[PDB]
Structures are given as C-alpha cells and as structure tokens.
Ligand binder design. Structure first.
Ligand SMILES: *[C][C]([O])[C]O[C][C][C][N]C(=O)C1=[C]C(C2=C3[C]=[C]C(=O)[C]C3=OC3=C2[C]=[C]C(=O)[C]3)=C(C([O])=O)[C]=[C]1
Ligand SMILES: *[C][C]([O])[C]O[C][C][C][N]C(=O)C1=[C]C(C2=C3[C]=[C]C(=O)[C]C3=OC3=C2[C]=[C]C(=O)[C]3)=C(C([O])=O)[C]=[C]1
Ligand SMILES: *[C][C]([O])[C]O[C][C][C][N]C(=O)C1=[C]C(C2=C3[C]=[C]C(=O)[C]C3=OC3=C2[C]=[C]C(=O)[C]3)=C(C([O])=O)[C]=[C]1
Ligand SMILES: *[C][C]([O])[C]O[C][C][C][N]C(=O)C1=[C]C(C2=C3[C]=[C]C(=O)[C]C3=OC3=C2[C]=[C]C(=O)[C]3)=C(C([O])=O)[C]=[C]1
Lengths: 462, 434, 454, 428
RNA sequence: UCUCUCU
RNA sequence: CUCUCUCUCUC
RNA sequence: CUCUCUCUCUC
RNA sequence: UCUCUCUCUCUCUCUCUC
RNA sequence: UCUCUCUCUCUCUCUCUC
RNA sequence: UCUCUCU
C-alpha cells in the first residue's frame, strides 16, 4: 500500500522534472536572463508554444487550411526583455518540430503528455480565476449564476481523463447541452459513422458526469439522460435541472495545484530531484515549492501588485470558486472578490503601451496549507450497524434506509428537490479536517478555523 | 461436563501465566523500573519483539533478502525511560534467538503459540479501536460503511483458527475478494502446485466464513461461492452482497478480552497463580484483573487522558464496534465516538518531540461487567439472494436480541443476578465510527 | 428462423475455436516431440498425444494415483508409444511427459482456458473408434443384458468425465447399462441408497434417468422410464423393466446424436495450412468434417498380412460414427463397398507393446467419401384446435377427445408389432455432393447385408 | 476398452491388497508360531495355518460349538498339526489357539479390515486341492446322481460361506447336487417350503437356481432351469430334469470360472521378499500366479514309498485347478507328462494323526511350468431340443480357435503357441 | 446428595 | 467371455 | 458462545 | 528496529482545429 | 446476399458421485 | 505409461 504511493509520487515528480528541465532548455535557447526567465508572462508564452506544437489535430488542420500570413509549422508568442530598465515585447517564431524535439529530449525521448495536461490545467485554472464565462452560459440556456460549477471550462478536448477529473459539473453539462442542441438542429447528428462516434462520446461524457455526482438520485437521473436514443428538449431540461441541483448537492470535482513552468524550472535549476523526493498535486509539495520561489510579473500602470499576486495564487491553487473566508485563512491576507481587484488579466495584449509597463514581485506565499479535495462535501459514510460484543438484551441498531436503498419512483426530480430542501447553508462538512502549518509536512496536527466573527463575503464572483 | 471446563480454564490460565512471567523476565533484562514497566508503550514494544522473533517466514525472508541497514537477526523497538521527570525514547536491539529462548523458558521450555496469538489479538483489537480501514475497503470494492464487520483486519496469517474466530465477516470477505481479484488479473492463479495450495486455502476460508454465518440462506450462498472452479466477477459480487447482508443478518464473531502484557506481568509478579485459579477470556476474569491494575501511558501535549483511557478500555474489551449506549452502561462513563476523542493512537512515533510528552494513569475500570458473546444476535429456489433480501426486509432496528441477558455487578462472580438496561431516555449516538 | 441464423453462426464459431485449439495444441506437441511431417500425420502418434492430454486432465484418477502410486510409475508423468521412422524402418519408443507440462501446453494452445470441450471431443473420437473396432458383448452379458442389442452400445467406452456432450452422443443401451450397474451395487450393498453418499447416488441416478428418458420418442417408453426413476429402492423389478426398455429401443429407436470427431492429426494439418476454423466456423454434423477429410492425408501402421483398405474403412467408419449404421447407406456415401466386421482383415488401429515393431509398414488411409450426408440425432418414426381471427358468430371447434387424452408394457409391445422393417424414414432426405456445400439438391438412394456386427 | 484400462488396473490393486494381507498374515503367524525358514515353506504347515483362520471366522459353527460344546474340545480354541524339524527328524504337535487371537492377527494384517476376500481365496485353494486329490462318488451315488459325472464336481467341497466368489468357481454338478439335497429335504419334510423358514429357503432355492442358469450357455438349458425354478413345490419331476441337465453338461458344458489359488506359504515368501502386490497388482487368471510359482520354493512331507514328482504334480494341478482339464493340455503347459489319478503313487497331501511321523521325509515340490495359459470362465461351443443339440456335438469340434499358450518370458501374452496333439481323463 | 428453556 | 470381481453363509 | 483447531505469499 | 482514524494520489485519452 | 409445409437438414455447451 | 472384435 505504501509502495504504490511512492511509485505514484515518483511518476508525478518525473513529470514535474521534465517540465522544469524543458523550461530551463527553452530559457537557454531564448537567451533569457534570470529575471526574464522568472517572468510569468514569458513562462505563459513558452507553455503555449509547447501546447500548440503538440496540438496534432490543429496542426494538421492548419497545414490543410493555412492561416492568413502565418507559417503553419511555426509557433510563437510575446517574449519580454528588459533593456535599460525598459520592458519591450518581441514576437519570435520557433519551428513546431524543434519544440517537439526539445520537449521529448526534456522527458528523455518520451512525448510525456502528462506534463502537457498539467500545463493545460494550469492555464485552465488561471482562466477560471481571471475571466468569467457568463456569455457561454447564457447562450447554452443555463443560468449565469452557476459559475461555481464551470471549473475547467477552457480545457481543450485533448486533456482526456486527466483533465476530465478537473472540469466541473457545469462544463460537462454545457458540453452535453451543446451536443443535444446540435442534435436538435440537425437530425443527421447521431447518424452515420460520425453518429456512432458522437454517440460513444455522449455515453462516455455522461458516464464521467455520473461519476462526478454523489447522491443516488442524481446518478439515476443522469443514467436516464444517457439511455435516450435521440435526446431532445426533455434531456436538455433534465441536464439543466441536474446542474442547478449541483449547487446544493455538490459534485466530486478534482482540485490540483498546477504551478507555472517558471517555478518548476527554477526548482530544477536549483537542484531539486523531483524523481527522488516525489511530488503530489494535492499535498504540501506545491505549497513548499511556492514558499521559496520568486516570480515576477508585468504590472500595467495604475494597478495593485497585491491584487495580481492574489489572483495568481488563486489560479495556482485552483481556489477560484473557494470560500473567501477559508482562502483568506490559508493565505493570511484578505482574498478580495473579483469586483474589487484593481487588476486585469496576467497576459499582456499586443496593443498595450510597452513603455509605461512595470515589473513587480508576486507574493505567492501562504501562512497555512491544506489538502486539496475531490469531494464536494457531504450530501446527507461512517458505521451503519452494530456488531454485538456483550451478551446484553439491548436493541441492535442499524441504518435501515441506507442498507435497503442498495437493495431496491421513476421521477427522481421530486426526490432531488426534497434532498436539497432538507439541506441548509449551515451544515459542517469535512468534519475533523483542518489547515496545517508549513512545518507540519506529515499533516499530523490540524487547525480548525472559527469563522464566527463579523461576516465577510464568501463568493469570489459576487 | 464440569471437569472439561476446569481443564479449559487451567489451560488458558497457563497461557496467561506464561505471558506474564515472560513480561517480568523482559522487564528484569531491560532494567525497567516499576513505573516504566507499567507503561503501555513499553509493553507494546516488548510484545512486538516477541511477535517478530517468532515470525518464522518473515525472519527467513529477511535472512534471504536483508533489510536496509538492519541486522535480520535482531528485533527492537522504542523503550521509554524517565530521567529527572523527563521521558526519553531509546532504540535497543535484542537477538531473535535470545527472545525465543526467553519466551520458551517463560512457558517451561515450550513454544506456546497460544500466548503469541493472544498478544496478536490484543494488538488487532487496539488497531480496530484506533484506526479505520476505509482505504483498504474502497480498494477492494466494498463500501466504506461496513467497518463494523472489519474486526480483526490487522491479524496476520499465522494466527490460524484461534485468530480466525476473532476476525469478522468483513475481513474474510475482503481476503476472499483479494484472492478473486488476483485470479481475475492472472489466469496462472489457481494453476500448479501453488494453485492447489491456494484452492485449499480458498476452500478453508470459505468454510470458516460459512461457519460465521447463521441463517441457512447465507450459508447456501457462501457454499455456492465455494463450489466455483474459477471464481470470477460473479462470485466477487456475491461476496459483496453477503457482506452487505451481514449488516442486518449479522454473523458469529468471537469477542475476547485480550489485555496488554503489562497487566498480566503485574498480576504474576503480585502472586496470582492463573494455573490454579483459572482464566476465561469471556467472563469476569479480565474485568477483575483490570479493576485492581494500574497502567500508565504517554500523553502528547494537548490531549485528554480520559479519552485515551476510554480508547484503551475499548481495545481491551474489543468493544470498538459495540453500541455506545451499552458500552457506556458497562463502563459508567460516556464512551465518546471516535470523532470527538481528542487523542491520537497509543503508539508514539520516532519523530515526536520527546520533551513535552507527559505521563497519565489509564482509567481501565468499569462499573458493570458482561459476558462476551460469539453470537451476532437473533436472525428470525437456487437464487437465495431474493430470500436473503426478504429476510433483511422483515427485520427492523428495534428487535430485542439476547433476551433475558444483562450486565452483572463486579461482586457477582457467578453471574447470578442480571441487570437489564433501559435505554428509553433521550437518544445518544450508537456508532463509534459515525 | 431468421433469428436462429445468429445462434447457428455463434455455435459454428465456438466449435471452430475448439477445433483450432486441438490443431494448435497438436502442432505445438509435434514440434516439442520432434516429429517429422510423416510421423506427425501418423494416426498412431496422434492417438498417443490425445491420450496423454486426457490423462493429464484426469483430476480424479491422478489424485488416486498420488495416494496409491502404482509400481514403478510415478503419478505425475504420462506418455505413450511414439513411432518414428529412421532409415525407412519403424521403431517405437515410450515417451514420458509431466502432466503439468502437458496441461500448460494445452491451456496455452487454447488461450489460457481449460477448454474441456476439446477434451470431450477427443474422447468422443476415441469412443467412435472403439465402437467401430471392438464389440463389448462381455459387458452386456455380465450386466445381464442380451448380447444382441449391440446397436444401442454407442459410446459405451465414454468415461464419466464426458457430461452433457458425452451423454448426448451415447445410446440407449449404454445408458441402461449404467442404470443396471447402479441397481446391482444397491442390491449387493445394503448401505447403497442410504447415508450421505446414498443421497449423492440418488441425484446421479435421477439425472441419468431423465437424459435417458429424453432419448426416447414414443410416449409409452418415456412413461415406463419415469416409473423406474420413482423407485426409492430399485431392485429386480426395475432390472427387468429396463431390460424391456432396451429391447424396445431396437424397434422404437431413440434419439442418439451422431458427430464426426476426427483425429487431431487432421486438425493439426489443417491449422498448419493456415486454415482458420474460428473465422469460417465448423460443425460436427454438417459438411465441414467431410470437406476436411477430402483434403486431408493420414498415414497409419499396417500389420503384416492386413488389407490397408479395410483399416481405412474402419477409420472412416469411426470418423463419422457409422459403426451401427446401415451398410447400404454407408457403402453409398463412401462410394466403395463397406464390409461387415467379420470380413475385415485387420485388427485394431492401436499397436500393442508386445508387437514386433520391425515387420510393420505404413500406408495412407483412404478417408475419402464420394458423397456427404448430415448426421442425425433422431431415430426412426396435425391441427386439433382453432384460433379465431374474424369477429363472426361461428363456433370455435377443437378436437376434444385428443386434447383431454393427454391429461406401460402391453402398449409398447403393441407399438412394435405394428412396425415393420420396410417403413420409409427420413422421407425426401438424401445424400449431397462434395461440391454442393449448401445442401441444395439431395440425392435419394435406391437400394446385400445391412448389419456391420452380424 | 480405453475406459476399462482404468477398471482393470483398479481390480488388480484390490486383488493385490488381498494377497498382501494373506502374505502379511502368514508372515506374522510364522513368526508367532516360531517356524524356521524350512518349516514355514512346508505345505502341511501352510494348510494348518490356513485351516485355523477359516475356522476362526466360522461364526455359525463357532456359535453352535459354544451352545453345544464338543467332548474334550472347548469351542473357543482352534489349531492343527504343526510339523517341526529339529535334529533332522520330523515331529507333529497339535497347536491350540484362541479363535479371537487368530482373528485379531488376521485383521491387523489387513489394516484392521475383515478382508473376507482373503478367506474365500484360501477356501478356493482348499477346494482345488481336494478336487485334484479325492473323488467324491459317494455323495454322487448318495444323492441319486450317476457317479460318472465327476467332471462337473468342481468346488463341491466349498462351504456355503463362500458366496458370489465361491459360486463362480463351483461347477454344474455341485450346483445340481445342492438343489437335489433341497428337493430331497422338501420331499421328506412336508413342512419344508412352508412357514417363515420356508420363505427363506425359497429365496435360497431361487438364488442358487439363478446362478446355475447363468452358468449355462445354450438357450435350451437356461429355459429348462428356468422351469425348475418356477416350481413352487419341487418334487421327483424336478429331480429328473436336474439330473438330465447335469448329463447335458457333459456335452454342452457350462461356464465355470477357474482361478489359481496358491498356498499361503507362497504368498508369505513373496511378501517377505518385498513384493508389493498392491503396487504391482495381481490377477488369478493371468500370468501372475505362474510367475509367482516359478520363483517360489515349497516343501512337502513325503510318505514312504511315494514318488515326489507325482505329489508335486498333484499340487501343481490343484494350484491351477486343472483337476478336470485335458491331460494333453495340462502336460503341454507343464512340460512333463501329467499322469492320471489311478497311476499316481501318492496319497493326499494332508497327514493323518494315525500316521507314524517318524519315517516321513520332506521333498521339494516342482511347481514350475514350461508354459503359461489364461484361465477361462467359459466352456467350448426344452428336452428333445437338448438331446438334439448334443447329438450334433462331436468330440472333435475345435474350441478356443486361435487361442494358445504363451511363454513365461511373454508377460503381455502377445504371441500364442497353439498346441498340436494318449489318455485325456484324470479320473478315468 | 447436581444443574439447565432456546447451536 | 485373452483376464474387465469382489467383501462371505438360510450366520 | 469457553477450548485444540493452524497459516497460498514476509507483505 | 515503520507509520496512520475517517476513500479524494495515479494510467485512464480525445465526435470536430474551433 | 439461405432455405423449408407436416419428428429434430445442422441451434453446440465451458467435463465426473472429484 | 494396458489390452481386446464377437459369453
Ligand atoms: C450496447 C451498445 O453498443 C448499444 O449502442 C447503441 C448506440 C450506438 N448506435 C449509434 O450510435 C448509431 C446507430 C445507427 C443505426 C441505427 C440507428 C437507429 C435505428 O433505429 C436503426 C439503426 O440501424 C443501424 C445503425 C447502424 C448500423 C447498422 O447497420 C444499422 C446509426 C445509423 O444508422 O446511421 C448511427 C449511429
Ligand atoms: C472433492 C474435492 O476434493 C474437489 O476439489 C476440487 C478443487 C481442487 N482442485 C484444485 O484446486 C486444482 C485443480 C487443478 C487441476 C485441474 C483443474 C481444472 C480442470 O479442468 C482439470 C484439472 O486437471 C488436473 C488438476 C490437478 C491435477 C491433475 O492431475 C489434473 C489444478 C491444475 O491443473 O493446476 C490446480 C488446482
Ligand atoms: C448420558 C446422558 O443421559 C446425559 O447424562 C447427563 C444428564 C443426565 N444425568 C445423568 O444421567 C447422570 C448424572 C450424574 C450426576 C449426578 C447424579 C446424582 C447426584 O445426586 C449428583 C450428580 O451430579 C452430577 C452428575 C453428572 C454431572 C455433573 O456435573 C454432576 C451421574 C453420576 O454422578 O454418577 C450419573 C448420571
Ligand atoms: C499485507 C497486509 O497485511 C498489509 O500489510 C501492511 C500493513 C501491515 N504490515 C505488515 O504486514 C508488514 C510490514 C513490514 C514493514 C516493517 C516491519 C517491521 C519493522 O520494524 C519496520 C517495517 O517497516 C515497513 C514495513 C512495511 C512497509 C513500510 O513502508 C515500512 C514488513 C517488512 O518490512 O518486511 C512486512 C510486513
């Protein structure tokens, strides 16, 4: 049981080491200095170069249908250099085959797609913490208020099962609803070989959505949605109902700390063997890495570097939809809602005035650290029954409804509504779990927060 | 009929006396004082030394494949000494042959494996009362909520039939499911001489599981599981069904009070001849031994000694999965569920700060005493799943089992006048792990 | 139909997969025993290889051998006579193989599964060869049965390990002999039918009575078997009653399945030739065995002063399980006259240890038939109601006496007296040509002896 | 076949276990009677030991001896003449033994099992010896049968305790004589065939008639024996047809099983040599008895003026039950001419009390045969039809066509040696 | 000269 | 019937 | 309901 | 000669470049 | 992508009283 | 790891 855990840690560390040494090689090939190599924007550009080089289907499409005034075999992006204290942007072009060769040499001749998926999740978390997706929500017919379920909405299809665990209930519902809308518009959807392929995709997406849900009624309803040969308006409405139900009876969304490649590259250049030490995306390793890492960023004139650092921290730990109170408790500084952040996105546009732009250090440090969870809370585990030890008269208790429900009407909407009506926004989940100090590597002594003072806000996008 | 009972008591007392005099000899050889000899952690270390010395197969494997920076012929453990009121831990190493010689001399030149199995059951009960096994449950595909059937999950294979009676339905189902999973992955399982041996093991484990069950339908279903030449997914699912059915139509799991060796050693040094008086693991003897025994333990800073004492009491009487109401009635103090116990495990890790650690006396005393039972209560065509489901559907969590049986006062040695509890006041919790 | 095509296709693939395993296993064993093409195609060598497999998977006998080992023979090794041709002369050397080694080789050939269907297929092939070669009248008399009912002795040498598949191919006479031996042991041993074992024997007795009952066709015969089954302590009354049942089967023949189980050498040669039985499928009652034998060349050991054609006819008879079939029909299908057993100038196929393996020569077996027919699981030899479709005032007729009619020994005797040895059975069904793979145009024959064992 | 190989191997082990018990028990009794190697190999000693065991397990006679004790003999002790050679000369002393002690020794030698097969095997050996030595025309004349059918008296001395196995080896004449005694008892006693005991007698009469019917071969003989069985009150008429059936057996011979039951001394010697009959197996109709006798040395007590060769021939014939066989075939198998009974200069093997055990010397028995053959349970090939059948029968029809005699070195019986053939009647 | 409803 | 039966008796 | 039951593999 | 109350780590691979 | 009125002209079976 | 057409 311990051996499997140590191999898992070694494999994750291998992925991290590959990403870091690729970043070091890219910094060497780009002639970036230490400061320029630690800039988050340069790392964003380099990661996007990697992702676009290995986007096989898009590359093939670009070869078949060339873009306007662009070579389909070259990637690029903005690389920022400091000359005499002034920042300037450059568009430098790299062959896709060269990028692929460098990445494979970084991973010891292997095209490790796990690191690519890691960078993809990092970008998705950053986009989730920065930009809202209300327009896409409204277009598909879902309420703009279920933004908390839209984690991982920018993750592309090539992420696969690794990225599927990260995307929330809202994004899966949105994709299924898009499929149903396409089927409603054109009946030739779900017909032909493409029809068989899209039916398989629909079944697989419904199955992973079902795995996301926790209560039996939600699983039964998504099962009923999956069983329809030609899903129409009814299944789209049922999906919307399930998405709204996910606000109270939450789902199992996997949260991982995917740091920018600059941190990994600095760690690998420092001499940290992730293969020997081991890495975990849900434990203390990202926190320990972020505490002793220095990252720089570009601050547009009249912006608050503290707000940008908070945004990057939230993106790194995928805490965009987290309660502001617990996020502030872990960070030690107030996590300000999105409305009151005097900052724009991390990425710099091509039309910006690259003469008033400044540079600031990012405060990616937290007082406490906590375990990142897949669970969405308790829906209402333990000991169901008693095993008698003493020969005493006594009633022998057991949880009869829970035992029987595994051994047994067809309208589960009423049951779901009843379950959500029973719930109150005051129940305590994750009982007995707390936040650990940075020195508590083994997570032995937890600290439970007491939020029973004057009330701060709780929703980042509120 | 009485003569056989008195010989059984004499044999059990012989085992207890051997364990106690071994503990006395070990305390003499370790230069432990009385307080240090009564510490539960030192007794845990000594018992683990005994078990590792006599773990023949592991010792042979260690000789063939040496461990990293360890002598395969030496056992050890943390021994705690008090100097100027400050506790300090020491790692002292003892030859395995020396430990075996001392143990055999304790049992009069005999390698009494019964005492080793007794210590094994004590450790298993402590682990059951302290640590939950939900990860192993989920890995094997069983619900994490059938923890009440996982009694004796940490018992090693060398316990045999004595330890097999103690392990519950959940652990046996889990082991059978592991075997089925191994067979599913590799077809060379159940083939060859190893295949014949593992088929024999599977049949024996199925037979003792069948003996565990009470109703005829459960026995028929486990019989059908046993009869399959190549058990696959269907038998694993049927085993899961039987495990879930065991929550309502419970099984026959044997409960024994296996005390730490410190209590036995103190009793033997006091002058209690277990051979002449006789010992029973299901009667008043463990209660009477625990009432007049003093045990010390190490309390980490910011812990409740009452909660640790309750944990040790539950471990001693194997009441981990017991109803909290009856356990509190027998103890006289509220048995708090695991979630609200402000205490960690008994054992101290090697990385702990051995300068803020304190010592506390363990309150292993109960107001009443009760007989420990093997029974799981009263239970009242070729597809017996439907029949089992019907039987469980008939049952309600209000039926009274063990009718006419009560808890006896400590002075009632012969168990003559029972006391029946009336739990008909405001409801406390009932599940320890809830 | 139109739904049983799928089921027919499923069965063909499953049998083809079994045939593939036998061929794949034979090829592996041939390369491991170091046998050339000629020796690989020898029927005697294939017999030894097949018997080695059957003994390696005999769990019960192997256990008994371990507990009570024989003298000089360890119960973990099997083997048999392997015949090799060196310098033109033939020599026999006894090969010893570990049963675990043979079991692993067989399992590896069938993709790691036990595949007892392949073993039962080989056991049926041995039973067919035994039936066509040797006549067991001594067992018939020893059990008290009349030695004249040799036509019902189909599969009398099949071991009990062949259940279902073996039981379907075995005949009424063999089934009755099994019942009689159970009865005799009960009469001799009073403990029989009593105790824990008596319960096991009773269930075994019930099961084989039911399968025997399903073998019969007339209602009178089935009712007679049903009575015998009910007897809690069977004795002489059931002994005589079953004897009457066997005698009745000569006229009111039961349903005995007939399958063409070929030697493993034929399958091995076919599989080595790239032939894929699993893909195109197979059938033991269709044209597949006939087409395989046409293209297959098999050699055998011929003892001095033995007609090679007569041995080839014996192997041909065993291949198609036509030992008890009419000589005229067998002669028509083969194209060359089939001779009775008394006029066959040959001994058994299997060569004995005490035989001088120096005057022995090998010959090719002529296992080719001019025609091909479908093997039958049947023996020899209207509307009574109405279902209205229109709403009219008519009266719905039914044959009342016949419907209520279906709600011993004199009746059976009356049935056989009416029967005569001239009734035409299988009316309109004939024999096809090898080029006619779809059974489109039957060729009805027009027909001096007709008894092989006469 | 190919399925009866397992059955044959199973039967061989069961017979070998019986012989092992016989050999093991003899070894113990020799060690417990304190018999030397020479005395243990004496055929007279082996018979005495065998007779002690058979009487020790005779429940009915033992019960009658208890209820009605004999004069000077307690019914709980058995024994016989044991011949011991010390100082060159032979002497006989009666040994007395508890029947229960003998029973325990026999049972312990058979792993605690009764092993009634071994006792019957010894009983068949004694019958074979009696048949070759003594001719019982007195019983034939007393029962009303013509004394000329002495060829059908095979196993006439076998006790009724040997059921199944005993009945298989006994002949038509013995079966007829048993029935004739039943008829004579019924005719004399009117209460016979009536009452509770009459029912028991009727079932015995039916069962022994059934085995006689199975002993016959021609359909005519079976039907007539079927008629005799159906008689509820058999009398003189059933007397006659049984006599006629016996006379027909001289021409239309029945199927009588022939087994080679050797003396216990041979088995004891073989077991002491380490031979494991259970492992190697045994058979009473195959080569095993012949191969055992070739390597076995046994001695006998010779009365003065007696030819050792004739006594050895008598033992050889009794061993293989060739008392009523053709002398030419017996001579061909043995290799030395077999002499008829009238020309044998020897008396019975057993020595009587009234015989002076002082002029008696011992000789080695030549129980070795040049050839070996397989013992047969078969013969060769209303009432007017029966007489018609035996009229067509001639004493020249060849039987067992193509079946011959093999060599001791040919253990698989691969190459038969067909004989080509002046008397042929032992009792003639 | 003993004790017990209900593996 | 070239081997394929025998666990005993009107006990 | 106590007791001997002894362990497929170090796990 | 080890540690732990209370499944969340890991391979899952992509209907279409979107 | 077959054929047939009217008793099996094709529909196995995943081995044994282990 | 045996042998046999046909009491
Ligand atoms: C079990 C499972 O596998 C099941 O699944 C189901 C689903 C899938 N499918 C799909 O996708 C498809 C199909 C199809 C078809 C159809 C449809 C409908 C109806 O009704 C009919 C049909 O038919 C058919 C098909 C296919 C093929 C064939 O052959 C036939 C489609 C079309 O058609 O196009 C598509 C898709
Ligand atoms: C009564 C009782 O005893 C029964 O039991 C049963 C079970 C046991 N077994 C086991 O475990 C085993 C077996 C085996 C075998 C087999 C299998 C399967 C089949 O099919 C066949 C067979 O065969 C055999 C065997 C063994 C031995 C011999 O000889 C043969 C195994 C293997 O094989 O490996 C294992 C186990
Ligand atoms: C065998 C059967 O029957 C069962 O048994 C048991 C029960 C009944 N009982 C009897 O029988 C007996 C008993 C006894 C006893 C007694 C007697 C008398 C008196 O008084 C007392 C007593 O005690 C006792 C007993 C037993 C046991 C115990 O524990 C006690 C006897 C004697 O003793 O002897 C006999 C018989
Ligand atoms: C299989 C089942 O039973 C589970 O398993 C796990 C848990 C329990 N345990 C066991 O069994 C074992 C352990 C071990 C170990 C040890 C021992 C001793 C000492 O001292 C130390 C140690 O350490 C460790 C281990 C394991 C793992 C880790 O990680 C650490 C063993 C050895 O070592 O051999 C065996 C068994």
């Amino acid at each position: 049981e311990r051996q499997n855990a140590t191999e898992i840690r070694a494999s994750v560390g291998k992925m991290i080491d590959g990403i870091g040494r690729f970043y070091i090689q890219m910094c060497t090939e780009l002639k970036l200095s230490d400061y320029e190599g630690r800039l988050i924007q340069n790392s964003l550009t380099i990661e996007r170069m990697v992702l676009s080089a290995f986007d096989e289907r898009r590359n093939k499409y670009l070869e078949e249908h060339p873009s306007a005034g662009k070579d389909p075999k070259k990637t690029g992006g903005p690389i920022y250099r400091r000359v005499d204290g002034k920042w300037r942007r450059e568009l430098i072009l790299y062959d896709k085959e060269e990028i692929r060769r460098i990445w494979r040499q970084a991973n010891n001749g292997d095209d490790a797609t796990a690191g690519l998926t890691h960078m993809m999740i990092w970008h998705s978390n950053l986009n989730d913490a920065t930009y809202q997706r209300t327009r896409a929500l409204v277009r598909t017919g879902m309420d703009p208020r279920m933004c908390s379920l839209m984690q991982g909405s920018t993750l592309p299809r090539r992420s696969g099962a690794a990225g599927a665990a990260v995307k929330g209930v809202g994004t899966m519902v949105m994709e299924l609803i898009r499929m149903i809308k396409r089927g409603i518009n054109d009946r030739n959807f779900w017909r032909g070989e493409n029809g068989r392929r899209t039916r398989i995709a629909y079944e697989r997406m419904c199955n992973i959505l079902k795995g996301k849900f926790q209560t039996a009624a939600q699983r039964t309803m998504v099962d009923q949605v999956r069983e329809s040969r030609n899903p129409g308006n009814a299944e789209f409405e049922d999906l919307i109902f399930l998405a709204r139900s996910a606000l109270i009876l939450r789902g199992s969304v996997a949260h991982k700390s995917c740091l920018p490649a600059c941190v990994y590259g600095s760690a690998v250049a420092s001499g940290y063997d992730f293969e020997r030490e081991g890495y975990s995306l849900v434990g203390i390793d990202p926190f320990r890495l972020l505490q002793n890492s220095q990252v720089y960023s570009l601050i547009r004139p009249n912006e608050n570097p503290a707000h940008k650092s908070q945004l990057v921290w939230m993106a790194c730990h995928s805490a965009a939809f987290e309660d502001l109170r617990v996020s502030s408790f872990i960070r030690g500084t107030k996590v300000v809602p999105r409305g009151k952040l005097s900052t724009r996105g991390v990425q710099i546009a091509s039309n910006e005035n690259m003469e008033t732009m400044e540079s600031s250090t990012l405060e990616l440090r937290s007082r406490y650290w906590a375990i990142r969870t897949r669970s969405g809370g308790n829906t209402n585990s333990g000991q169901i029954s008693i095993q008698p030890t003493f020969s005493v008269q006594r009633n022998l208790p057991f949880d009869r409804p829970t035992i029987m429900a595994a051994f047994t009407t067809s309208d589960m909407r009423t049951e779901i509504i009843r379950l959500m009506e029973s719930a109150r926004p005051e129940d305590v989940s994750f009982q007995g779990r707390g936040v650990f100090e940075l020195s508590d590597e083994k997570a032995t002594s937890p600290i439970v927060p007491s939020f029973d003072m004057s009330n701060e806000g709780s929703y980042f996008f509120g």
